[PDB]
Design a protein around this ligand. Structure first.
Ligand code: HEM
Ligand SMILES: [O-][O-]
Length: 151
């Protein structure tokens, strides 16, 4: 359980993200795909992309980044009371998209990296630890739903 102070740190940096949702989504997905190429293979939409330049030039990828971060933002603003938001997400990612929890660990690492690059004065150690905890909570709760479903 995050404390109120931890959530304040999370949402303070998140408010900085929401000034440029699409730029952040690009950086995060590209980082994910480059650091963990098995993740790219899960996207029939995107597996044709073979270079970083090609990824950066894809408007479809940029749009999907907005989808991802919009969903995450809605989850983070619920401060843990996010059951209703995670049910559909867990159900699609387990059963349709076939995404292992480990790959949620990978995108969490990419999120934290990009936040540090883009917002260092609002992403000091205190805020990094709080964001790590928020993304851990996200993963914990998705993992429980996966387990229910047999994934
Ligand atoms: C912060 C973590 C993530 C969030 C908030 C998130 C959110 C979403 C949302 C809102 C959608 C569209 C609605 C749906 O199908 O449920 C989607 C689609 C998808 N997600 Fe994620 N996602 C996350 C992580 C991942 C990861 C790590 C992978 C792959 C490694 C992944 C693979 C997919 C795929 C394959 C689709 C369908 C793309 C398409 O239109 O073809 N997601 N995700
Ligand atoms: O990727 O969602």
């Amino acid at each position: 359980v995050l404390s109120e102070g931890e959530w304040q740190l999370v949402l303070h940096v998140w408010a900085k993200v929401e000034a440029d949702v699409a730029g952040h989504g690009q950086d995060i997905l590209i980082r994910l795909f480059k650091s963990h190429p098995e993740t790219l293979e899960k996207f029939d939409r995107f597996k044709h992309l073979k270079t970083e330049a090609e990824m950066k030039a894809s408007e479809d990828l940029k749009k999907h980044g907005v989808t991802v971060l919009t969903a995450l933002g809605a989850i983070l603003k619920k401060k843990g009371h996010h059951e209703a938001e995670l049910k559909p997400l867990a159900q699609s990612h387990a059963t349709k998209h076939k995404i292992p929890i480990k790959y949620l660990e990978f995108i969490s690492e990419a999120i934290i990296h990009v936040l540090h690059s883009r917002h260092p004065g609002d992403f000091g150690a205190d805020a990094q630890g709080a964001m790590n905890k928020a993304l851990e909570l996200f993963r914990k709760d998705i993992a429980a739903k996966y387990k229910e479903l047999g994934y």
